[PDB]
C-alpha cells in the first residue's frame, strides 16, 4: 500500500520502481491586470520521474502550450502527468517497465491508476514520506532545460552523477534528499554552500559538484546545519 519509514529499504531492492512527483507540472506567476484584476501566466513545467535505485531521472518537460484553451488546469495537470507517465512506461522495453510507481501526492493516485489500467501488474502506491522533489527546479541545469524548452520534450539525467561508483543507492538517495531539502528550505544558502569554493566544479556531464568523499561529508554537515538553522529561524528556537 503506502510507503513510509518502516519499509524504506524497499526503495533500493531490485524490483524496478519509479517515484512520480507532479509539483512542478503546472506553474504560474500571478499578476495584476490593467483593470486591477488578477491573472496568472503559465511557465514551462516538468514531471519528475525518478528510479531511486539507479538515479535515472526521466524529466518530461511540460511546455506552456499544452494549457492553451484548457480549463481547470490544476486538475488537468494531474491527468496530463498520468498520461505522460503511462506513455513513458509503454515506451520502455518490458524488462525495463517498473513493477511499482510511487506518487508523491495522493491526488495523483486515481489519475495514474486510470491511465494504467492496461498494466494491472504495476502497483500504484502513495507514500507517507515528505519528499523534497519540488526543489528539483533549484537544480540549475534542470531549471535551465525546462525554461529553454520551446516544445514538449523529455530529457534524461542521472540525478546521482557518478556517486554510485563510491556509495550505495541508499546513501545516494539520502544525500539527494538532504540536498533537495536544504534547497527547499533556503535555496540561497544551499547554493552558496554548494558553490562557495571555485576549485570544486560541476562537470559538463553532471548536475552537482565534483566533491571528494571528505568534502561531501563537510557539505552534508553544512546542509544539516542549514536545515537546523532555518528550523530555528522559522520557529524562533
Amino acid at each position: 500500500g503506502a510507503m513510509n519509514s518502516s519499509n524504506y529499504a524497499e526503495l533500493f531492492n531490485n524490483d524496478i520502481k519509479l517515484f512520480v512527483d507532479d509539483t512542478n507540472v503546472y506553474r504560474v506567476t500571478v499578476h495584476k491586470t490593467f483593470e486591477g484584476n488578477v491573472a496568472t501566466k503559465a511557465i514551462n513545467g516538468c514531471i519528475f520521474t525518478l528510479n531511486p535505485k539507479t538515479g535515472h531521472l526521466f524529466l518530461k518537460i511540460i511546455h506552456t502550450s499544452v494549457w492553451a484553451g484548457q480549463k481547470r488546469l490544476s486538475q488537468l495537470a494531474k491527468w496530463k502527468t498520468a498520461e505522460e507517465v503511462s506513455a513513458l512506461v509503454r515506451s520502455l522495453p518490458k524488462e525495463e517497465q517498473p513493477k511499482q510507481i510511487i506518487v508523491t501526492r495522493k491526488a495523483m493516485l486515481d489519475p495514474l491508476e486510470v491511465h494504467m489500467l492496461d498494466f494491472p501488474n504495476i502497483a500504484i502506491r502513495p507514500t507517507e514520506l515528505r519528499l523534497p522533489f519540488s526543489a528539483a527546479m533549484s537544480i540549475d541545469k534542470l531549471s535551465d532545460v525546462v525554461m529553454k524548452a520551446t516544445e514538449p520534450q523529455m530529457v534524461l539525467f542521472n540525478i546521482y552523477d557518478d556517486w554510485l561508483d563510491r556509495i550505495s543507492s541508499y546513501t545516494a538517495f539520502s544525500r539527494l534528499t538532504l540536498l533537495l531539502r536544504a534547497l527547499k528550505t533556503n535555496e540561497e544558502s544551499a547554493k552558496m554552500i554548494l558553490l562557495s569554493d571555485p576549485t570544486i566544479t560541476i562537470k559538463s556531464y553532471h548536475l552537482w559538484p565534483s566533491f571528494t568523499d571528505e568534502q561531501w561529508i563537510t557539505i552534508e554537515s553544512q546542509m544539516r546545519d542549514l536545515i537546523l538553522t532555518e528550523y530555528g529561524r522559522k520557529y524562533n528556537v
Binding site: 491527468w79 498520468a82 486515481d110 489519475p111 486510470v114 491511465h115 489500467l117
Partner: protein, 300 residues
C-alpha cells in the same frame, strides 16, 4: 387476488410479505396469506425467532404458478414449493379460507408504496440475477454474495448483478481517461444502457431489486449494487430528462420506506452526499433531497 398457503408453522418465526410483517408462534394454527395483489412481484421472507441469523425469502409472481410454503425439519427452513395439480391446490386453499386460517395481505386502497418500489421489477429478470432454473420463484438470503464480491465463493448461490466498476477498462475509453472518469456518461449511456441493459427500465428494475434485497434481507452485496447504480447516474453529466425524473421518484419511495432505525447501516454517507450535493445531478433530485434532508439530516 391470490393465495400462498402454508402446510404448517412448526417454528416461531417473523414472516414478511412485501413491506409488511407479522409474528407467528411455534405451532400456531397459521395456514398462509390471502388477498395478494395480482399484477406485481412479491417477496415472502422469514426470520426465525430462535435464530435471527439468516433472514431468507422467496421472490415470486402468482401469475406464474401456484406456490405454497412448507417447513422442512431437515434443512431447517420454510421452503417455497410449486403445486402443478391446480384442482387439488384450490380444494386445500378453499378449506383454510373457509376456516379463516390465513392472514390478509393488508393493502390500503390509497397506498401505492409497493407498486412504486417494484415498478420495473419483473420476475423474468429476477431469475437471471438469481440462478435456479427448476423453480419459478427465487430464493434470496442475508449471506448470498454477488458475482463482483466473488471477484474480489459458490457460483450457483450468487447474485448475478451487473458488475459496475468505475476504474475498469469497460468504464474508460482509451484516450478519454480524464473525460470518462470525471463524467461517466459514456459508461452509463453507451456501455450500460445501450450495451447491457438495452433500456432504462431494465436498469431501474435491477436497481429496485438491489434495494429491496438489501432492506429486506440485510444483503451487503445488494446494498453495494444499489449505491453503485445511483452513483453511476448521478456522476453522469448527460442523462435523459425522463430517467432523472423517474430516478428521483424511485429513490424517494425507497427512502420513504426505509426503517428509520436501519438508516445507519443501509445508507452510504459518501455516496449520498456526493450524489445530492456535489454531482452533476445535485439539483435534479428534488423529491429525494427533500425527504433525505427532513428524515436523515444527520447523514448529511
Amino acid at each position: 387476488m391470490n393465495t400462498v398457503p402454508f402446510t404448517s408453522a412448526p417454528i416461531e418465526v417473523t414472516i414478511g410479505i412485501d413491506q409488511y410483517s407479522f409474528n407467528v408462534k411455534e405451532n400456531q394454527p397459521f395456514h398462509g396469506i390471502k388477498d395478494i395483489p395480482i399484477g406485481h412481484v412479491h417477496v415472502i421472507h422469514f426470520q426465525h425467532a430462535d435464530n435471527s441469523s439468516m433472514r431468507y425469502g422467496y421472490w415470486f409472481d402468482c401469475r406464474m404458478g401456484n406456490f405454497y410454503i412448507q417447513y422442512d425439519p431437515k434443512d431447517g427452513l420454510y421452503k417455497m414449493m410449486e403445486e402443478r395439480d391446480g384442482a387439488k391446490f384450490e380444494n386445500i386453499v378453499h378449506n383454510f379460507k373457509e376456516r379463516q386460517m390465513m392472514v390478509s395481505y393488508p393493502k390500503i386502497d390509497e397506498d401505492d408504496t409497493w407498486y412504486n418500489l417494484t415498478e420495473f421489477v419483473q420476475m423474468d429478470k429476477i431469475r437471471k440475477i438469481v440462478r435456479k432454473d427448476e423453480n419459478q420463484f427465487s430464493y434470496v438470503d442475508s449471506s448470498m454474495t454477488t458475482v463482483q464480491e466473488n471477484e474480489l465463493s459458490d457460483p450457483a448461490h450468487s447474485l448475478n448483478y451487473t458488475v459496475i466498476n468505475f476504474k475498469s477498462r469497460e468504464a474508460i475509453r482509451p484516450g478519454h481517461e480524464m473525460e470518462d472518469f470525471l463524467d461517466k456518461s459514456y459508461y452509463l449511456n453507451t456501455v450500460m444502457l445501450q450495451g447491457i441493459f438495452k433500456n432504462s427500465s431494465n436498469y431501474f428494475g435491477e436497481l429496485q431489486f438491489a434495494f429491496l434485497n438489501a432492506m429486506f434481507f440485510g444483503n451487503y452485496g445488494s446494498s453495494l449494487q444499489w449505491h453503485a447504480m445511483i452513483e453511476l447516474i448521478c456522476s453522469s453529466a448527460t442523462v435523459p430528462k425522463h430517467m432523472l425524473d423517474k430516478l428521483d421518484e424511485i429513490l424517494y419511495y425507497q427512502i420513504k420506506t426505509l426503517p428509520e432505525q436501519y438508516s445507519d447501516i443501509l445508507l452510504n454517507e459518501r455516496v449520498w452526499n456526493i450524489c445530492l450535493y456535489s454531482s452533476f445531478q445535485k439539483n435534479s433530485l428534488h423529491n429525494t433531497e427533500k425527504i433525505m434532508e427532513n428524515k436523515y439530516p444527520e447523514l448529511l
